[PDB]
Design a protein around this ligand. Structure first.
Ligand SMILES: O=P(O)(O)OC[C@H]1O[C@H](O)[C@H](O)[C@@H](O)[C@@H]1O
Lengths: 604, 121, 242
């Protein structure tokens, strides 16, 4: 079989349906894989009857069509930039075979399958179907070597058998997490007492037993076994009882600007929108200078412990103290963007934006009349008793009626005596029980004027259609100065990776898949200069980790503008490293190794 | 009954005990305000396109003095924005514009409102 | 010859004896300004119409979120004023955009103008290079090109100062300080100084182009100057920026 002209079959649950983070990975990776394989590349997944309608040969490729025909013989659906060819198998059209199969599977490899585990049910159906399909192709196509890549425990039921049935195709398995990993990280010390855990018992205790097998089986069955990051490789070694053959870090489809410095302008533009918001939010209590203010933010799923919301808030309180003590003239406005159950924006939020917007309009009116007066003087001078080229007394320009309306607008911005700018933009459904808000209250960050650190919880996805902070997420990030994602469990940091791509420096952790990748590529002291701050969450106590996180924030606040600007340039050059153009090579290396392992025709 | 095409919008301006403006009131003002601004953006680019055509005619293969196809002026990114703003203005299914701008302290006992609810305006 | 899609507008900013700007120079700015204003009025109307459709949809028989026909937005009175503005921009038949912005005192005897006339760069449409002689100091108070000298330079892409006598090249120096690449000569004090500091093939990458006016015949110098110019014109935007 031909190794150079090979085929590529990539399989996952998340193919045409956006269930989770793999959807985005596969989607963003399409352009480079298509670019290399043209028509040879096929994605395979389950058919999502509800939403598949939304997302939606040659002779050397002819064997496919007959194998599809063979599958159609036995009673299948054949998109995004790069427009890769897709196969979505209707699992309802095969639901009947399940009992024969679930039993087949049970005796096959002793993988139990409770009738309730609807997800496993689907996972199995998929696995048997795909294995069946690939097996067909393997006979029907004799020219090409075949590569079968599989993503995640749910899609890895076809893998286990391909070793059993000894199908001629080479296989790859990538796990983007581990089941036990997540589940142990239920409440709480995962990273330290990991090597000393029982895979079988703890799984039984968690109640996966069956789904843990399918993952473990998949990992073992596979010719090549891969994870997304070192930290997860380490995790997968001791928990899935196999050292991975390598890392497949998640790249991004980086959109390059014709001018490198354009991101810099975008930053300034978006920051103006945040400034606008902030002015409103602090209406009546506005005692600091935005030109000397920094915007920190955390964002992600509301996972208080896991995503480091606790550490973030604690650290912010500590930083606040440091800055007060040190007499810093800087201010930090910290955003938390984590969706929670809410009743939408508060009246106060909307009202303050309006009140500011009205002031802006009145100023605009007043300045146009001032203009007519300045102009009159200028064009009239030196005639009619005008001693000077320009007006010298403000009275000549600013009249009583102008002052009255301005004063009214100012008055409307006043807040009730003792009232402070809120710490939340929204009416929460369960305010008293909210963890974030509890934590903020506990450390007493209530946006008092003497606080150099300010707190703004925004318990909703950012969206340009929002009426107060009218920015899409990507825009908002650009506008900010520092992303802060002190995660605990995170096989891959999509977030700080996205943040880096926007030319914004970020704080991450060494237990984060992204932070792990970066600490391997760059000496950790050198890495801060490229705007990648990595917190130690492995060889330090939580309290020490916090103090480290604070040090980092304090270090960054002390930067000048020039320094901030340059660091952002440095971080943007770094965004290349996260481009699929570079990260797709690791997928290559994984695929070629998969050829050498199974069908090793070439001596050299 | 007379099939008049006119509409009457009747305002009642009588101070009552309230808890300020409703979120809906303020939210809708903003939503429209956002739409106004996006249109202003889009028109500016249309303007650049009309202008280019006008300064360039009759050269570069311009048969006509002015653009004739909207496609020349209106681009898909423009459309997406405008469509996003329009979507933001949507009301939940079956919801009608309210009869009151404010959150009332004693809504159920309010005379004016009870009267309106009785005649079903 | 090469079939290049590029265009080069070439400015000459050298003070000469003149009787101020030409009426044509001033009238054309005004005629274009009047077009810009008319367009601003017309897009305002368009805005009101797009807006009205957007706010009203899906009611009142509006199928489609947006207008789809230009007729809905653009109306006859709008079209009339636009057309009037376009008509006013028309030049007399066979007239070409001038090669000078001012009324020269001694037009016939002027060396610069005579040279242009001689090489026949008259700004015809088929000419991929255009000539504009501005015989006056640039100044932001000027009514047609309202830029101070420094500003104008920043605006441009390439300074071209192929001097013969130039003890110190103030000009390509100022040009360099403004981040604008320049072409100078090796008989220029500035070009000599730069020749000394940088390997001449490496210097082209740092936007310093040096022409040989010492070990080369005047006709070879020119073909070098032209080689440089054409090399630059072949550059992409990304390359220019860098
Ligand atoms: O947001 P800062 O770190 O103060 O950045 C401020 C700077 O942002 C960008 O670099 C802009 O291009 C500069 O004009 C601006 O001064």
């Amino acid at each position: 079989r031909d190794l150079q002209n090979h085929l590529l079959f990539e399989t996952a649950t998340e193919v045409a349906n956006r269930v989770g983070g793999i959807y985005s990975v596969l989607k963003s990776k399409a352009p480079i894989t298509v670019a290399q394989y043209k028509d040879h590349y096929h994605l395979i997944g389950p058919l999502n009857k509800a939403t598949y309608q939304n997302e939606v040969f040659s002779d050397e490729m002819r064997p496919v069509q007959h194998a599809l025909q063979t599958m159609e013989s036995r009673g299948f659906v054949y998109l995004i930039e790069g427009a890769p060819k897709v196969i979505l198998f209707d699992l309802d059209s095969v639901r009947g075979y399940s009992n024969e199969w679930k039993g087949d599977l049970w005796s096959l490899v002793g993988i139990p399958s409770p009738e309730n585990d609807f997800e496993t049910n689907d996972a199995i159906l998929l696995g048997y179907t795909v294995a069946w399909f690939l097996g067909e192709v393997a006979h029907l196509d004799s020219q090409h070597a075949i590569v079968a890549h599989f993503h995640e425990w749910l899609a890895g039921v076809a893998l286990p058998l391909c070793r059993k049935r000894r199908i001629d195709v080479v296989t790859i398995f990538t796990t983007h997490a581990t089941l036990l990993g997540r589940y142990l990280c239920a409440s709480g010390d995962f990273y330290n007492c990991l090597e000393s855990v029982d895979v079988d018992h703890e799984a039984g205790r968690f109640g996966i037993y069956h789904r843990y097998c399918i993952e473990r089986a998949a990992a073992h069955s596979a010719d090549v076994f891969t994870t997304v990051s070192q930290i997860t490789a380490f995790e997968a070694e001791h928990l899935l009882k196999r050292k991975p053959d390598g890392i497949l870090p998640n790249g991004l489809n980086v959109i390059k600007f014709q001018a490198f410095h354009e991101f810099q302008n975008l930053h300034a533009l978006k920051k103006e929108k945040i400034n606008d918001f902030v002015r409103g939010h602090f209406h009546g209590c506005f005692d600091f200078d935005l030109d000397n203010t920094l915007y920190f933010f955390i964002a992600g799923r509301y996972e208080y412990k896991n995503k480091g919301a606790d550490m973030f808030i604690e650290a912010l309180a500590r930083l606040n103290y440091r800055l007060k003590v040190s007499g810093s003239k800087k201010t930090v406005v910290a955003f938390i963007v984590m969706p929670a159950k809410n009743n939408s924006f508060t009246v106060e939020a909307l009202k303050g934006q309006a009140e500011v917007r009205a002031l802006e309009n009145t100023v605009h009116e007043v300045t146009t009349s001032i203009g007519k007066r300045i102009f009159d003087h200028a064009i009239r001078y030196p005639h009619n008793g005008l001693t000077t080229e320009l007006p010298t007394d403000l009275g000549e320009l600013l009249k009583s009626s102008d002052k009255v309306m301005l004063k009214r607008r100012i008055l409307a911005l006043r807040r009730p005596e003792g009232q402070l700018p809120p710490i939340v933009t929204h009416n929460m459904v369960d305010d008293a029980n909210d963890l974030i808000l509890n934590k903020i209250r506990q450390v007493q960050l209530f946006n008092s004027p003497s606080d150099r650190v300010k707190m703004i919880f925004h318990p909703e996805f950012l969206n340009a259609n929002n009426p107060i902070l009218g920015l899409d997420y990507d825009e908002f990030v650009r506008g900010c100065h520092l992303g802060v994602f002190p995660s605990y469990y995170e096989p891959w940091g999509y977030t700080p990776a996205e943040c880096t791509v926007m030319g914004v420096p970020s704080i991450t952790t060494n237990v984060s898949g992204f932070g792990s990748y970066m600490e391997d590529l760059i000496e950790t002291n050198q890495a801060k200069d490229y705007g990648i701050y990595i917190v130690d969450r492995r060889f330090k106590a939580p309290d020490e980790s916090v103090e480290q996180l604070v040090d980092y924030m304090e270090e960054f606040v002390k930067k000048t503008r020039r320094q901030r600007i340059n660091q952002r340039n440095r971080t943007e050059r770094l965004s290349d490293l996260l481009d699929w153009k570079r990260m797709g090579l690791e997928y290559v290396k994984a695929r070629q190794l998969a050829l050498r392992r199974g069908y090793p025709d070439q001596f050299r």
